[PDB]
Amino acid sequence: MAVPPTYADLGKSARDVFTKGYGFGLIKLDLKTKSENGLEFTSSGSANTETTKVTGSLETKYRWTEYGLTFTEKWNTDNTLGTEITVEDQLARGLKLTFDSSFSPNTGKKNAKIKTGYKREHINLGCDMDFDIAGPSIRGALVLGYEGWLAGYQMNFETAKSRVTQSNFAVGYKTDEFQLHTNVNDGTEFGGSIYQKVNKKLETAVNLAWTAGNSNTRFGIAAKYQIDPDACFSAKVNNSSLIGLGYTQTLKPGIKLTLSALLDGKNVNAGGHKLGLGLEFQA
Amino acid sequence: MAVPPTYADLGKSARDVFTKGYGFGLIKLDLKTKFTSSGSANTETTKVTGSLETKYRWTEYGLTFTEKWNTDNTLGTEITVEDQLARGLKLTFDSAKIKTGYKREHINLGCDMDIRGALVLGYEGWLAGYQMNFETAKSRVTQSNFAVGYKTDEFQLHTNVNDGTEFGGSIYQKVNKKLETAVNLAWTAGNSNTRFGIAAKYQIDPDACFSAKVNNSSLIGLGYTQTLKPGIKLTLSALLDGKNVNAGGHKLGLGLEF
Ligand SMILES: CCCCCCCC
Ligand SMILES: CCCCCCCC
Ligand SMILES: CCCCCCCC
Ligand SMILES: CCCCCCCC
Ligand SMILES: CCCCCC
Ligand SMILES: CCCCC
Ligand SMILES: CCCCC
């Protein structure tokens, strides 16, 4: 409805046209399993193309619908363990408390955090408490919204340094089929995204980002046209002539196949082009 | 409706929001007779100038006579013959310039000779265009202009690539029966030289009109047009430089219609 999204989720539809539906240089085979209403199992097997690094993950997710509890745990072949607990709507008027934790061998990740969010008709507030060993920090999210107009501010205060290390503003406007968003980070990093839905299934997205002094200019355009109710086709170009193609097709009620390819328009002949494959079985 | 415009007229609706409604640093005295009497007076050059035009109409037989005498005593002869040798075929001998062009339901053809060649194709609001300029004295093309866009009554998008070096774009929008909004963008490939600008034309009443531009160079443009009397439209304009507010050499103009 009119509930404003989180600061990290505004301008998401334009971002999903660029990201969703593309698998580059990866052989992704996932299997989803929902045996009961709450329990969900998901094991994935990916193989890198450039480095030939096979990575297999195992995720167990259970949902407690009555008490609002939500448990999420992830496992990986690299022993990169992650756990998340989400309590939603336990307190009055749409509250949510989340406990995240990620552990990794030798990479130096022993981080865990406590997230806190508040939602209403026009206000969306977020509070994070990262416990990184290098230094704890508090993240504050504030999003204003009324009549399709959005306004957001994000702040991260690092207690180890006793100062705010990042302060991001965001102003945007969105409709049912049109979304315009503007982002400025630390006064020097700027950005903007325009989401447009042309037809019943034609999503048009334009992304623009640059730094202070007309530097690091990066712009592009993406599209997500479907030809069939079961087939999705995606294409995107940027100023570096990187052309990304993607074709998503579900072959049967529980099988999904995704073909994708990245082409370097600068050097077509041996320019480091990438092919990707994605199989998602439903069970 | 379905007929496409020429290459010089595609994306004109968004351009009219920027161009029309402004007489900067100029006292343009205009008189419309149904004939064109326009007298331009620069406030900085201080050189009174006035040009006149006459047009004889023969609509039943399909010919027109045109002759214009400018201030600096230069005159140009121009005659056009259209819809005779073929439906939509239009010839023009201006000055001495020979202009030929074909206009149909989905194609706008044009071959100017003084050579310029343009072609515009249209289908369901989608427009493709390409124009070239071939210099016979240089034995090489000097301009290669390509454009493509999508046109609708309330929204118009237009892109431009001239000589493969400079890119451009324009957006037209009509959010109300009296409010308009146009966006402009142009830049050169391989360079940070960008040119971004937005304008609007608000119409308070059928006799009043207000316009406003702004540029990334902090060039603020304002314009108010009123029709206090039937047959006399007074338009006021002022150019404001945001870079030099004090002693910046700002330009204001005044236009009268009759
Ligand atoms: C419109 C808000 C201005 C943002 C200034 C940037 C300071 C971090
Ligand atoms: C609306 C587009 C703004 C472009 C900013 C200039 C990029 C260097
Ligand atoms: C319209 C896209 C052109 C990209 C060129 C920018 C780098 C020269
Ligand atoms: C909407 C595309 C704007 C690109 C500007 C690039 C300036 C170097
Ligand atoms: C009006 C309720 C919002 C409270 C923010 C601290
Ligand atoms: C909305 C708070 C801004 C702090 C810089
Ligand atoms: C609703 C039509 C939008 C075309 C860009």
Swiss-Prot record, chain A:
What controls how active this protein is?
Answer: Inhibited by nitric oxide.
Residue intervals passing through the bilayer: 26-35, 39-47, 54-64, 69-76, 80-89, 95-104, 111-120, 123-130, 137-145, 150-158, 163-175, 178-185, 189-198, 202-211, 218-227, 231-238, 242-251, 254-263, 273-282
Q: Which residues carry this modification: N6-acetyllysine?
A: K20, K109, K252, K266
InterPro entries linked to this entry: Porin_dom_sf, Porin_Euk, Porin_Euk/Tom40
Q: Which residues carry this modification: Phosphothreonine?
A: T19, T107
The UniProt gene name for this protein comes to: VDAC1
Of the GO CC terms on this record, one is: extracellular exosome
MF terms from GO for this chain are: ATP binding; ceramide binding; cholesterol binding; identical protein binding; oxysterol binding; phosphatidylcholine binding; porin activity; protein kinase binding
**What family is reported?**
Belongs to the eukaryotic mitochondrial porin family.
Species for this entry: Homo sapiens
Protein name stated in the entry: Non-selective voltage-gated ion channel VDAC1
